[PDB]
Design brief:
Blueprint: E1 14-20, H1 23-27, E2 33-42, E3 47-57, E4 75-80, E5 90-94, E6 97-102, E7 107-115, E8 118-125, E9 128-134, E10 149-151, E11 154-162, E12 168-176, E13 179-185, E14 194-201, E15 204-210, E16 219-224, E17 230-234, E18 271-274, E19 277-282, E20 290-297, E21 309-321, E22 325-331, E23 336-347, E24 357-367
Antiparallel strand pairs: 1-24, 2-3, 3-4, 4-5, 6-7, 7-8, 8-9, 10-11, 11-12, 12-13, 14-15, 15-16, 16-17, 18-19, 19-20, 20-21, 22-23, 23-24
Bound molecules: a molecule of 6 linked components (NAG-NAG-BMA-MAN-MAN-MAN), the ligand CC(=O)N[C@H]1[C@H]([C@H](O)[C@H](O)CO)O[C@H](S(=O)(=O)O)C[C@@H]1N, 2-acetamido-2-deoxy-beta-D-glucopyranose, calcium ion and nickel (II) ion.
Subunit structure: Homotetramer.
Binding site for Ca(2+): 211, 215, 242
Cofactor: Ca(2+)
């Protein structure tokens, strides 16, 4: 009954529309949670949307100044995918940073809350607290903000503690039925790792992450489930996936080093390999969280000089706000499929018409079929929203 994900990756020609929740538009005529850092994860039957609530609904005095990242009121929300975060939504744990995943039998939730310099991560499995760990470097323990990955009952989750603009202490935790059974330190060539988007790649787990220090190319962390070994590098592709970054004409990348091109800061993102090619998404603006696009870089997984992209799709047009994005994987009859969500951020600080900060989501899944074009932005009229 445990998931093992021992099927080949599906053939992927692109991505087709899967879900959208319209939560900000709904917020203007209904009681909807303020959120950020959303993600998607599916049990063997159905998918769920998650997000970090801000302990308030949008049309509510407490939505003021929800641009703040960490408060004791943030909790992890969980609904079936496509059900918006209404007041019946379950808060599954206290968290201003989270990861969740289903091992085939039950849900694991990794939830981080508490003091910036002395946070706690609770591990909740099958509806009960099984373990916890304290911040090891006293500098904002934080994790993936997207699904973890379980193989044969062993789940893995990437966690970082320490500087956001320098060497930090990243660890890969191995969790069985909610108990931390082993911990490995980040090893290899990735020099800064945050907010990993991880996927099953039998027999292991592979992650594409955020370098917040010197890289606008994304780190890769590869996790061996059996022997707990870790290796790490960077997505080779000369079309890089972080924001900020240089323009397509002047950017470059390395397979084993951060490129040092607009490296500081970043945004959660994702990519995955298909042979020597790489599928990746990124904002369309190279400086800001405007627009979202996907495409395949031919030999982009192994050749750091390639900028040869194909199969581009606009998900969110360049005139509209995007935000975080991350991967999740869905088991099919004969192959493992790859999907992604996009966070559509509205409000402060970039938009000052309102006092709050929140998001909606849109979701696409890989397809072996055909597909057209479009743009699926947030759609809320900020000028007519409650303040
Ligand atoms: C990160 O988080 C971790 C985990 O939360 C932190 O580690 C924890 O830190 C706790 C605080 O130091 C520690 O609890 C303490 O344990 C010591 C034993 O080593 C114990 O003595 C402490 O209790 C005294 O101090 C607390 C304040 O912290 C008082 O509220 C309490 O009343 C106790 O003070 C009383 O007794 C002392 C006797 O020695 C007197 O000095 C003091 O004046 C006071 O006396 C009054 O009451 C007396 C009766 O007890 C009475 O005789 C007298 O007349 C007075 O009326 C406290 O329990 C945890 O053990 C520790 N946890 C772990 C797992 O290590 C860590 O600090 C955090 N780190 C950062 C960087 O934030
Ligand atoms: C745990 C935590 O506070 N995470 C926040 C990160 C973090 O500050 C950076 O990754 C640097 O460590 O920043 C993002 S962002 O949207 O501001 O880019 C917002 C997130 N809530
Ligand atoms: C929102 O918060 C700021 C300070 O955090 C405060 O000065 C301002 O008055 C608040 N606005 C409202 C409408 O309460
Ligand atoms: Ca960066
Ligand atoms: Ni270099």
């Amino acid at each position: 009954e445990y998931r093992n994900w021992s099927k080949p990756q599906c053939d992927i020609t692109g991505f087709a529309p899967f879900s959208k929740d319209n939560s900000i538009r709904l917020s203007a005529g209904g009681d909807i949670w303020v959120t950020r850092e959303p993600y998607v994860s599916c049990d063997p039957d159905k998918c769920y949307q998650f997000a970090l609530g801000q302990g308030t609904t949008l049309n509510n005095v407490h939505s003021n100044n929800t641009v703040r990242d960490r408060t004791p009121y943030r909790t992890l929300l969980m609904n079936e995918l496509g059900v918006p975060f209404h007041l019946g939504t379950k808060q599954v744990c206290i968290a201003w940073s989270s990861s969740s995943c289903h091992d085939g039998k039950a849900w694991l939730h990794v939830c981080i809350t508490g003091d910036d310099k002395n946070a706690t991560a609770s591990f909740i499995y099958n509806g009960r607290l099984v373990d916890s760990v304290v911040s090891w470097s006293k500098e904002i323990l934080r994790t993936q903000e997207s699904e973890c990955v379980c193989i044969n009952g062993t789940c893995t989750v990437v966690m970082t503690d320490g500087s956001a603009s320098g060497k930090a202490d990243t660890k890969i935790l191995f969790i069985e039925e909610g108990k931390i059974v082993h911990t490995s330190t980040l090893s290899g060539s990735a020099q800064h790792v945050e907010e990993c988007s991880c996927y099953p790649r039998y027999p292991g787990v592979r992650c594409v992450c955020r370098d917040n220090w010197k890289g606008s190319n994304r780190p890769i962390v590869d996790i061996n489930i059996k022997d707990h070994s870790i290796v790490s590098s960077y997505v080779c592709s000369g079309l890089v996936g972080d924001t900020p970054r240089k323009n397509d004409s002047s950017s470059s990348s390395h397979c084993l080093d951060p490129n040092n091109e607009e490296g500081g800061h970043g945004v959660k993102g994702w990519a995955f390999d298909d042979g020597n090619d790489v599928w990746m998404g990124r904002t369309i603006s190279e400086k800001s969280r405007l627009g979202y696009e996907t495409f395949k870089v031919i030999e982009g997984w192994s050749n750091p000089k390639s900028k040869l992209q194909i199969n581009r799709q606009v998900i969110v047009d360049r005139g509209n706000r995007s935000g975080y994005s991350g991967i999740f994987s869905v088991e099919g009859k004969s192959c493992i499929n790859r999907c992604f969500y996009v966070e559509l951020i509205r409000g402060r600080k970039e938009e000052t018409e309102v006092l709050w900060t929140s998001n909606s989501i849109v979701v696409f899944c890989g397809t072996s079929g055909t597909y057209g074009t479009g743009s699926w932005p947030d759609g809320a009229d900020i000028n007519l929203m409650p303040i």
